[PDB]
Amino acid sequence: SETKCTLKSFTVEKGIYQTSNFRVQPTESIVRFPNITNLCPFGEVFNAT
Protein backbone atom coordinates (compact mmCIF):
# COMPACT_ATOMS: atom_id res chain seq x y z
CA SER A 1 0.00 0.00 0.00
CA GLU A 2 2.89 2.38 0.70
CA THR A 3 4.27 1.55 -2.76
CA LYS A 4 0.84 2.31 -4.23
CA CYS A 5 0.86 5.65 -2.38
CA THR A 6 4.32 6.74 -3.50
CA LEU A 7 3.68 5.54 -7.08
CA LYS A 8 0.33 7.40 -7.28
CA SER A 9 -1.38 4.44 -8.95
CA PHE A 10 -3.71 1.59 -8.01
CA THR A 11 -1.80 -0.97 -10.11
CA VAL A 12 1.89 -1.75 -9.54
CA GLU A 13 3.80 -3.49 -12.32
CA LYS A 14 6.52 -6.05 -11.65
CA GLY A 15 9.71 -4.52 -10.31
CA ILE A 16 11.49 -3.14 -7.26
CA TYR A 17 10.50 0.27 -5.90
CA GLN A 18 11.75 2.61 -3.17
CA THR A 19 9.23 3.74 -0.55
CA SER A 20 9.90 6.27 2.23
CA ASN A 21 12.62 5.50 4.78
CA PHE A 22 13.30 3.65 8.05
CA ARG A 23 14.33 6.51 10.32
CA VAL A 24 14.64 5.16 13.86
CA GLN A 25 12.66 7.23 16.36
CA PRO A 26 14.40 8.10 19.64
CA THR A 27 13.27 6.11 22.66
CA GLU A 28 13.25 9.02 25.13
CA SER A 29 14.93 12.36 25.92
CA ILE A 30 17.97 13.31 28.01
CA VAL A 31 19.17 16.79 29.00
CA ARG A 32 22.57 17.42 30.61
CA PHE A 33 23.87 20.72 32.00
CA PRO A 34 26.43 21.77 34.63
CA ASN A 35 25.02 21.80 38.15
CA ILE A 36 25.29 25.54 38.72
CA THR A 37 23.12 26.57 41.66
CA ASN A 38 23.74 30.30 42.16
CA LEU A 39 21.20 32.53 40.44
CA CYS A 40 22.57 35.14 38.07
CA PRO A 41 23.04 38.66 39.55
CA PHE A 42 20.09 40.28 37.81
CA GLY A 43 19.19 42.25 40.94
CA GLU A 44 22.28 44.43 40.54
CA VAL A 45 21.17 45.53 37.05
CA PHE A 46 17.37 45.53 37.31
CA ASN A 47 16.86 46.29 41.02
CA ALA A 48 19.20 49.27 40.94
CA THR A 49 18.57 53.01 41.19
Partner 1 sequence: MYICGDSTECSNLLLQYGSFCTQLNRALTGIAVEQDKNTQEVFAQVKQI
Ligand X SMILES: *[C@@H]1O[C@H](CO)[C@@H](O[C@@H]2O[C@H](CO)[C@@H](O)[C@H](O)[C@H]2NC(C)=O)[C@H](O)[C@H]1NC(C)=O
Q: Does 18 bind partner 1 (CB under 8 A)?
A: yes
Q: How does DSSP classify residue 4?
A: H
Phi/psi of residue 27, each to 5°? Answer: -70, -45
The enclosing H or E element of 5 equals helix 2-7
Q: Does 27 bind partner 1 (CB under 8 A)?
A: no
Q: Does 41 bind ligand X (CB under 6 A)?
A: no
Q: Does 23 bind partner 1 (CB under 8 A)?
A: yes
Residue closer to ligand X by CB (options 10, 46) is: 46
User: How far apart are the C-alpha atoms of 22 and 31, rounded to whole Å?
Assistant: 25
Residue closer to partner 1 by CB (options 24, 31) is: 24
